[PDB]
Design a protein around this motif. Sequence first.
Motif, PDB file in Angstrom:
ATOM      1  N   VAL A 142      15.007 -63.935 -48.031  1.00  0.00           N
ATOM      2  CA  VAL A 142      16.578 -63.204 -48.043  1.00  0.00           C
ATOM      3  C   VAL A 142      17.295 -63.916 -49.087  1.00  0.00           C
ATOM      4  O   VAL A 142      17.557 -65.057 -48.915  1.00  0.00           O
ATOM      5  CB  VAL A 142      17.224 -62.909 -46.969  1.00  0.00           C
ATOM      6  CG1 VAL A 142      17.960 -61.790 -46.652  1.00  0.00           C
ATOM      7  CG2 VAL A 142      15.922 -62.055 -45.884  1.00  0.00           C
ATOM      8  N   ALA A 143      17.805 -63.825 -50.343  1.00  0.00           N
ATOM      9  CA  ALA A 143      18.429 -64.113 -50.369  1.00  0.00           C
ATOM     10  C   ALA A 143      20.340 -64.251 -49.603  1.00  0.00           C
ATOM     11  O   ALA A 143      20.889 -63.741 -49.426  1.00  0.00           O
ATOM     12  CB  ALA A 143      19.152 -64.031 -51.811  1.00  0.00           C
ATOM     13  N   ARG A 144      20.099 -65.831 -49.147  1.00  0.00           N
ATOM     14  CA  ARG A 144      21.552 -65.595 -48.402  1.00  0.00           C
ATOM     15  C   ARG A 144      22.566 -67.246 -49.725  1.00  0.00           C
ATOM     16  O   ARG A 144      21.993 -68.067 -48.980  1.00  0.00           O
ATOM     17  CB  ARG A 144      20.982 -66.818 -47.467  1.00  0.00           C
ATOM     18  CG  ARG A 144      20.233 -65.708 -45.555  1.00  0.00           C
ATOM     19  CD  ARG A 144      21.065 -64.314 -46.122  1.00  0.00           C
ATOM     20  NE  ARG A 144      21.387 -63.426 -46.755  1.00  0.00           N
ATOM     21  CZ  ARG A 144      21.918 -61.970 -46.770  1.00  0.00           C
ATOM     22  NH1 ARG A 144      22.387 -61.938 -45.654  1.00  0.00           N
ATOM     23  NH2 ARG A 144      22.205 -61.621 -48.137  1.00  0.00           N
ATOM     24  N   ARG A 145      23.109 -66.337 -49.888  1.00  0.00           N
ATOM     25  CA  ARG A 145      24.357 -66.707 -50.748  1.00  0.00           C
ATOM     26  C   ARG A 145      23.871 -68.205 -51.611  1.00  0.00           C
ATOM     27  O   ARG A 145      23.966 -69.511 -51.693  1.00  0.00           O
ATOM     28  CB  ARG A 145      25.610 -67.369 -49.528  1.00  0.00           C
ATOM     29  CG  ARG A 145      26.810 -67.776 -50.459  1.00  0.00           C
ATOM     30  CD  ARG A 145      27.591 -68.673 -49.457  1.00  0.00           C
ATOM     31  NE  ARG A 145      28.244 -67.393 -48.562  1.00  0.00           N
ATOM     32  CZ  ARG A 145      28.858 -67.845 -47.347  1.00  0.00           C
ATOM     33  NH1 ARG A 145      28.967 -68.007 -46.476  1.00  0.00           N
ATOM     34  NH2 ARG A 145      28.990 -66.762 -46.637  1.00  0.00           N
ATOM     35  N   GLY A 146      22.545 -67.335 -52.583  1.00  0.00           N
ATOM     36  CA  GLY A 146      21.770 -68.292 -53.586  1.00  0.00           C
ATOM     37  C   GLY A 146      20.671 -68.898 -52.633  1.00  0.00           C
ATOM     38  O   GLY A 146      19.826 -69.611 -53.737  1.00  0.00           O
ATOM     39  N   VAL A 147      20.677 -69.359 -51.545  1.00  0.00           N
ATOM     40  CA  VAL A 147      19.510 -69.672 -51.267  1.00  0.00           C
ATOM     41  C   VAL A 147      18.073 -68.593 -50.347  1.00  0.00           C
ATOM     42  O   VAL A 147      18.878 -68.218 -49.921  1.00  0.00           O
ATOM     43  CB  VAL A 147      20.010 -70.778 -49.620  1.00  0.00           C
ATOM     44  CG1 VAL A 147      18.640 -71.722 -49.478  1.00  0.00           C
ATOM     45  CG2 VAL A 147      21.134 -71.424 -50.064  1.00  0.00           C
ATOM     46  N   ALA A 148      17.212 -68.989 -50.639  1.00  0.00           N
ATOM     47  CA  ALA A 148      16.144 -68.539 -50.758  1.00  0.00           C
ATOM     48  C   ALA A 148      15.855 -68.071 -49.603  1.00  0.00           C
ATOM     49  O   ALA A 148      15.133 -69.450 -49.190  1.00  0.00           O
ATOM     50  CB  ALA A 148      14.602 -68.403 -51.615  1.00  0.00           C
TER      51      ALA A 148
END
Length: 18
Positions: free
Chosen positions: A6-12
């Motif tokens: 899941v991409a969480r604010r840019g972070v994978a």
Amino acid sequence: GVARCVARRGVARCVARR
């Protein structure tokens, strides 16, 4: 068991959910 990335604010974030 489901490895979900899941991409969480840019972070994978790959987390295994069941």
